Design an enzyme around this catalytic site. Structure first.
Site, mmCIF file in Angstrom:
data_model
loop_
_atom_site.group_PDB
_atom_site.id
_atom_site.type_symbol
_atom_site.label_atom_id
_atom_site.label_comp_id
_atom_site.label_asym_id
_atom_site.label_seq_id
_atom_site.Cartn_x
_atom_site.Cartn_y
_atom_site.Cartn_z
ATOM 1 N N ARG A 193 40.722 35.481 51.297
ATOM 2 C CA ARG A 193 40.143 35.133 50.013
ATOM 3 C C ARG A 193 41.056 35.612 48.886
ATOM 4 O O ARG A 193 42.241 35.299 48.885
ATOM 5 C CB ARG A 193 38.691 35.621 49.985
ATOM 6 C CG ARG A 193 37.771 34.776 50.855
ATOM 7 C CD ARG A 193 36.499 35.479 51.277
ATOM 8 N NE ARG A 193 35.621 35.586 50.123
ATOM 9 N N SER B 210 51.718 50.315 37.739
ATOM 10 C CA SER B 210 50.418 49.924 37.201
ATOM 11 C C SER B 210 49.389 49.807 38.318
ATOM 12 O O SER B 210 49.736 49.728 39.497
ATOM 13 C CB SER B 210 50.522 48.681 36.341
ATOM 14 O OG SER B 210 50.588 47.503 37.119
ATOM 15 N N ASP C 202 34.272 42.138 37.144
ATOM 16 C CA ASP C 202 33.331 41.023 37.245
ATOM 17 C C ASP C 202 32.962 40.573 35.825
ATOM 18 O O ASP C 202 32.511 41.382 35.014
ATOM 19 C CB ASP C 202 32.099 41.435 38.060
ATOM 20 C CG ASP C 202 31.099 40.315 38.350
ATOM 21 O OD1 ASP C 202 30.927 39.416 37.496
ATOM 22 O OD2 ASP C 202 30.502 40.330 39.453
ATOM 23 N N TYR D 111 25.086 46.606 42.906
ATOM 24 C CA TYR D 111 26.365 45.952 42.779
ATOM 25 C C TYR D 111 26.837 46.070 41.333
ATOM 26 O O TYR D 111 28.013 46.354 41.079
ATOM 27 C CB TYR D 111 26.292 44.481 43.212
ATOM 28 C CG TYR D 111 27.544 43.733 42.844
ATOM 29 C CD1 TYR D 111 28.712 43.912 43.568
ATOM 30 C CD2 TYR D 111 27.562 42.875 41.748
ATOM 31 C CE1 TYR D 111 29.887 43.271 43.215
ATOM 32 C CE2 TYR D 111 28.717 42.186 41.410
ATOM 33 C CZ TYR D 111 29.887 42.409 42.129
ATOM 34 O OH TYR D 111 31.056 41.784 41.803
ATOM 35 N N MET E 234 25.867 48.193 38.952
ATOM 36 C CA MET E 234 26.203 49.586 38.664
ATOM 37 C C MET E 234 27.645 49.903 39.049
ATOM 38 O O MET E 234 28.396 50.490 38.261
ATOM 39 C CB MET E 234 25.215 50.504 39.403
ATOM 40 C CG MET E 234 23.852 50.449 38.751
ATOM 41 S SD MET E 234 22.584 51.308 39.742
ATOM 42 C CE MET E 234 23.198 52.968 39.475
ATOM 43 N N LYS F 297 30.196 47.789 39.541
ATOM 44 C CA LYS F 297 31.214 47.092 38.758
ATOM 45 C C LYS F 297 31.290 47.671 37.341
ATOM 46 O O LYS F 297 32.370 47.742 36.781
ATOM 47 C CB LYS F 297 30.962 45.579 38.788
ATOM 48 C CG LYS F 297 31.260 44.948 40.152
ATOM 49 C CD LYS F 297 32.724 45.129 40.542
ATOM 50 C CE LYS F 297 33.145 44.196 41.664
ATOM 51 N NZ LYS F 297 34.547 44.428 42.090
HETATM 52 N N1 LIG Z 1 34.062 35.860 44.773
HETATM 53 C C1 LIG Z 1 33.902 35.722 43.462
HETATM 54 O O1 LIG Z 1 33.738 34.611 42.957
HETATM 55 C C2 LIG Z 1 33.900 36.920 42.577
HETATM 56 C C3 LIG Z 1 34.803 37.937 42.815
HETATM 57 N N2 LIG Z 1 34.700 39.163 42.195
HETATM 58 C C4 LIG Z 1 35.525 40.331 42.644
HETATM 59 O O2 LIG Z 1 36.766 39.867 43.127
HETATM 60 C C5 LIG Z 1 37.202 40.678 44.260
HETATM 61 C C6 LIG Z 1 37.574 39.810 45.445
HETATM 62 O O3 LIG Z 1 36.469 38.906 45.758
HETATM 63 P P1 LIG Z 1 36.268 38.236 47.221
HETATM 64 O O4 LIG Z 1 37.608 37.851 47.770
HETATM 65 O O5 LIG Z 1 35.165 37.238 47.146
HETATM 66 O O6 LIG Z 1 35.660 39.487 48.029
HETATM 67 P P2 LIG Z 1 34.907 39.618 49.442
HETATM 68 O O7 LIG Z 1 33.444 39.822 49.223
HETATM 69 O O8 LIG Z 1 35.330 38.466 50.294
HETATM 70 O O9 LIG Z 1 35.552 40.980 50.018
HETATM 71 C C7 LIG Z 1 36.997 41.153 49.996
HETATM 72 C C8 LIG Z 1 37.410 42.080 51.113
HETATM 73 O O10 LIG Z 1 36.852 43.394 50.886
HETATM 74 C C9 LIG Z 1 36.890 44.096 52.110
HETATM 75 N N3 LIG Z 1 35.757 45.011 52.233
HETATM 76 C C10 LIG Z 1 34.421 44.754 52.055
HETATM 77 N N4 LIG Z 1 33.650 45.782 52.318
HETATM 78 C C11 LIG Z 1 34.532 46.775 52.729
HETATM 79 C C12 LIG Z 1 34.342 48.103 53.166
HETATM 80 N N5 LIG Z 1 33.150 48.680 53.299
HETATM 81 N N6 LIG Z 1 35.446 48.806 53.523
HETATM 82 C C13 LIG Z 1 36.648 48.215 53.425
HETATM 83 N N7 LIG Z 1 36.951 46.980 53.025
HETATM 84 C C14 LIG Z 1 35.836 46.303 52.696
HETATM 85 C C15 LIG Z 1 36.931 43.071 53.250
HETATM 86 O O11 LIG Z 1 38.065 43.311 54.102
HETATM 87 P P3 LIG Z 1 37.909 43.000 55.696
HETATM 88 O O12 LIG Z 1 37.729 41.504 55.706
HETATM 89 O O13 LIG Z 1 39.240 43.436 56.268
HETATM 90 O O14 LIG Z 1 36.732 43.706 56.342
HETATM 91 C C16 LIG Z 1 36.895 41.725 52.517
HETATM 92 O O15 LIG Z 1 37.663 40.684 53.110
HETATM 93 C C17 LIG Z 1 36.083 41.701 44.507
HETATM 94 O O16 LIG Z 1 36.410 42.950 43.915
HETATM 95 C C18 LIG Z 1 34.888 41.034 43.840
HETATM 96 O O17 LIG Z 1 33.846 41.919 43.457
HETATM 97 C C19 LIG Z 1 33.824 39.314 41.131
HETATM 98 C C20 LIG Z 1 33.163 38.294 40.634
HETATM 99 C C21 LIG Z 1 32.961 37.069 41.427
#
Ligand SMILES: NC(=O)C1=CN([C@@H]2O[C@H](COP(=O)(O)OP(=O)(O)OC[C@H]3O[C@@H](n4cnc5c(N)ncnc54)[C@H](OP(=O)(O)O)[C@@H]3O)[C@@H](O)[C@H]2O)C=CC1
Ligand SMILES: NC(=O)C1=CN([C@@H]2O[C@H](COP(=O)(O)OP(=O)(O)OC[C@H]3O[C@@H](n4cnc5c(N)ncnc54)[C@H](OP(=O)(O)O)[C@@H]3O)[C@@H](O)[C@H]2O)C=CC1
Ligand SMILES: NC(=O)C1=CN([C@@H]2O[C@H](COP(=O)(O)OP(=O)(O)OC[C@H]3O[C@@H](n4cnc5c(N)ncnc54)[C@H](OP(=O)(O)O)[C@@H]3O)[C@@H](O)[C@H]2O)C=CC1
Ligand SMILES: NC(=O)C1=CN([C@@H]2O[C@H](COP(=O)(O)OP(=O)(O)OC[C@H]3O[C@@H](n4cnc5c(N)ncnc54)[C@H](OP(=O)(O)O)[C@@H]3O)[C@@H](O)[C@H]2O)C=CC1
Ligand SMILES: Nc1nc2ccc(C(=O)NCCc3ccc(Cl)cc3)cc2s1
Ligand SMILES: Nc1nc2ccc(C(=O)NCCc3ccc(Cl)cc3)cc2s1
Ligand SMILES: Nc1nc2ccc(C(=O)NCCc3ccc(Cl)cc3)cc2s1
Ligand SMILES: [Cl-]
Lengths: 249, 250, 251, 250
Positions: D13, D137, D143, D156, D158, D160
């Site tokens: 992703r 950096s 979000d 969630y 809280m 962010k």
């Molecule tokens: N998707 C969207 O449209 C939005 C995105 N965001 C932010 O953008 C960022 C990326 O989003 P997206 O790609 O959808 O994220 P995902 O929900 O798909 O999670 C991204 C990765 O985080 C890792 N992860 C999750 N939980 C854990 C854990 N407990 N320990 C370690 N690794 C963990 C996983 O790695 P693994 O697969 O190796 O387990 C996962 O593939 C995030 O910070 C999200 O909050 C915010 C607003 C909306």
């Protein structure tokens, strides 16, 4: 002596409710108005019937022009001539209508929306401070300024400008002990002529009770800000919006 | 065919850096100026020497008045007249001076200049830009410090707040036309000409990142990003370029 | 009968001032405390001598742990046990100290206290307060007016207070259908730290535009009283700064 | 040699897009993963095939526990071990699911939603800074809809909001060390996999700019900007990349 307050656009709706609540609280009031002379007078007579010589009216157009400064000076002066003092200024008057980017001229739209919403508040603030104990100014802001109605750019610009004035004036007048705050309604008194079916669309969006604010609810926040309970509060804008601004698209 | 940009107040300082850097990126540029005739024509000569026929000047007062709309229409028209298109508008021109609430210009002139240049002209230029309408976008020069304002600068602050509102409102309204609207918000950058050097350093010392002001080029860099293909989903965003200044408490 | 309120960390300083003012407005009060047992019992005694059976104490650590949920549940239960109802929750309890990024307590412990007291316990207490609802219900969160211009080296405290803003908004949204309002009060500088010297105190005082002095505990309590009152019946998800203009002053 | 970046949750992703784009820009990269070893290695393979020995993987659970600190030290370590330096930290990993106020225990929810979303960024920030001319950096994935939260997503939200706080406090604190700290805030991007296809269109249609979600690459573009020399004066800024979604009222 009782303190005195100026409320702009006080003839009807939210400004009316603010003038009444201020009066009930013990203030003498200047009821400013533009077009609604009959409404303004009848409010004044009602308040004067409650307590003699506690309410006067004052007519002025708040549109931006080379005379606006003189007009704003006179509004403040009217409070001092009537009551010998001016403790509170409530910037309530507002023009509101869409100005699409793509039958008034554009320069009129600018004069009206920026004049009433931003520039007149600034001139009134200058006159209030220069003519100067719990002194305060309350500006009527808008809780939805960061999630604007489509095609309301000039209105939105004016309300953002008002936020800037609230902050700038709070900082600058704090040494004189004049506090400057805002009240930001979400959806309040809906237009009389707007169909109930359309009013309900707005009503339904509000988390807290699925209704618009009454004018009195907005006035309640104004009363708090001018009160002795808000003596340390300056540069703050209290949303009174029933959670409307928290709701995503 | 090369895209074209209008930069307001582009003769000197940050506007010049922006026009220079758009040009270097492939844009033809309208260099708007009010008073700085010499510097304007000088920059356009420099650009045109680099690639012929890629720079014009356009003179206009951006003070609010009943003819400000016609002047704004003209600035945009000038771009179409020189280059046949207008892809980018940069609202950079700005008046900046104190307007104390408690006491040579009348207050009505102060309002006209500060609210006109900082807010009303941007709105009118936006309208004209959108009406004449690829990667179209507008960038507004905002101000990182608008919520921690300089003492006695109420009208300037009000103008810059209004410009944030414009940025958001026009982003929303112009999105269906594929026009993006964003802002760049400097903190302390090029410091005013009539400033002492003890006083310059006072300000420099407040900046967490490197204890110095932004170069004009650093501001221009963010403008370049927002107009670029790398920002195609970004609209209604304001990027602070302030070195952390806005984060510092009193 | 008289409504009841829970006030966290209410034995001294701002929480006491809030408990006292709610009491004077006619509320029954739970005085939550952690370490300040003498001061808590003494305040309840005062309040009880004023109107009997109108104040109890409740001890609880609000550090994050697997038992923090039970502890927050028990605080709310304390109010129902003493008074039969719980109308108002004030999240006032707060840990406050530096956690420098480039470096006695372990970091685990820092996270537990600063995020636990300032954010997680408010969330759990909010959950328990709402679930127990079997009028004018509201929650007031004590936030921080200077959260976007933080003190150097206070990242975890700042993170917690920002989380608390997030809670205030999220809970306002979610609890509005149940008629529970959720709002915040954001002091700037109010009662300075006990351990702070006068010279340092005056440095802070001199930064406040409105009066060059800190907020009194009472002035903070006043805004709390506004938000729970019927004068604020349409206000939810608002944070009122009570900072004398401090957050407007640039570096 | 060449600069090095750590990207958390970089298997899939948004994190993968960020990793790939940093790589194309010339970074060597650590692909952190928790569950997705296959995907992580597959991405490493693709990047090393491009440029030899420029990508490594790193396993760690980022749930909050007594060992998160050690885990975060490890992630930063593996960058110094592989590449001899660590120029960029991208805090991308993130948990996301509802936690109603009125399965997992609450404290698991806390450990995941506050732990991964806020505490691990804070610890990685510490380790990153501790182990430090350069252009250093950190970029935090925030979000854009933080102030207009999804119903029943309080923990969630809280987490962010805490991440915004960390972005600001760390920008202030690390500015003396030349370390910038910024955020990128997506709106609707790659939607949840389990989310209905009709539910996804509902969201797409709300977005002013093009009635569609951001691609992962659009998010990555903003990250790239923030780490680049074009952002050398930018710290404590959060760039929304939401196509205007956050401007739309109820
Ligand atoms: N998707 C969207 O449209 C939005 C995105 N965001 C932010 O953008 C960022 C990326 O989003 P997206 O790609 O959808 O994220 P995902 O929900 O798909 O999670 C991204 C990765 O985080 C890792 N992860 C999750 N939980 C854990 C854990 N407990 N320990 C370690 N690794 C963990 C996983 O790695 P693994 O697969 O190796 O387990 C996962 O593939 C995030 O910070 C999200 O909050 C915010 C607003 C909306
Ligand atoms: N109602 C709502 O839902 C919301 C209201 N607000 C703000 O709350 C405040 C009060 O709202 P509301 O009562 O609905 O306001 P209205 O739209 O009813 O306007 C109030 C008064 O403004 C005066 N006014 C308008 N144009 C001018 C002008 N050119 N010169 C002088 N006075 C003028 C009018 O005076 P007259 O009739 O005498 O001509 C009018 O009665 C306003 O500032 C508004 O923006 C913000 C958010 C939502
Ligand atoms: N410099 C800084 O530290 C910071 C600047 N900013 C913002 O960044 C932008 C660029 O900053 P900077 O380069 O310092 O700007 P300047 O103060 O140097 O002004 C830019 C240009 O605006 C033009 N201008 C002024 N008044 C008028 C008018 N009535 N009509 C037309 N043009 C006018 C002038 O054109 P001419 O010379 O041709 O007369 C001037 O050269 C501005 O919008 C500013 O508000 C934000 C905060 C920090
Ligand atoms: N004081 C100020 O200037 C400012 C205050 N604020 C906020 O206002 C609120 C009140 O401020 P103030 O009165 O100074 O607060 P204090 O710092 O005095 O702390 C209040 C109470 O918090 C309780 N507390 C601390 N840690 C724990 C814990 N682990 N478990 C349970 N309770 C705990 C203590 O109870 P006990 O004594 O019984 O152990 C303490 O009396 C706080 O939320 C604060 O962050 C915001 C900005 C400025
Ligand atoms: N002076 C005034 N300022 C405002 C600001 C906002 C509103 C308002 O929210 N009105 C009802 C909602 C609404 C939104 C758009 C339109 Cl065309 C009509 C009504 C109404 C007014 S009246
Ligand atoms: N058109 C311009 N807009 C702005 C906005 C802000 C600043 C700025 O912050 N300058 C440095 C601080 C400062 C403030 C006032 C003065 Cl008389 C001098 C320097 C300078 C400018 S120039
Ligand atoms: N529980 C508490 N939370 C807070 C939050 C902020 C403040 C505060 O701003 N106090 C005055 C400023 C200050 C700066 C540094 C230190 Cl060591 C103490 C106080 C004091 C407290 S006490
Ligand atoms: Cl648990």
């Amino acid at each position: 002596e009782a303190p005195a307050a100026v409320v702009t656009g006080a003839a009807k709706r939210i400004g009316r409710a603010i003038a009444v609540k201020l009066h009930q609280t013990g203030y003498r009031v200047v009821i400013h108005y533009h077009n609604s002379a009959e409404a303004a007078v009848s409010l004044a007579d009602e308040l004067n019937k409650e307590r003699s010589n506690t309410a006067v009216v004052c007519q002025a157009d708040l549109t931006n022009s080379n005379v606006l400064p003189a007009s704003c000076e006179e509004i403040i002066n009217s409070c001092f001539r009537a009551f010998g003092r001016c403790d509170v200024l409530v910037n309530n008057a507002s023009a509101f209508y869409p100005t699409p980017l793509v039958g008034k001229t554009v320069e009129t739209q600018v004069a009206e929306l920026i004049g009433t919403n931003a520039i007149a508040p600034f001139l009134l603030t200058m006159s209030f401070a220069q003519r100067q104990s719990n002194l305060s100014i309350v500006n009527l802001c808008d809780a939805m300024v960061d999630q604007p109605c489509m095609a309301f750019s000039l209105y939105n610009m004016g309300k953002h400008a008002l936020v800037g004035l609230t902050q700038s004036a709070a900082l600058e007048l704090a040494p004189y002990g004049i506090r400057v705050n805002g009240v930001a309604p979400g959806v309040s008194l809906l237009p009389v002529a707007m169909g109930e079916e359309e009013k309900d669309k707005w009503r339904r969006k509000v988390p807290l009770g699925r209704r618009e604010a009454s004018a009195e609810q907005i006035a309640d926040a104004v009363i708090f800000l001018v009160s002795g309970s808000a003596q340390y509060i300056t540069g703050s804008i209290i949303k009174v919006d029933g959670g409307l601004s928290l709701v995503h698209a």
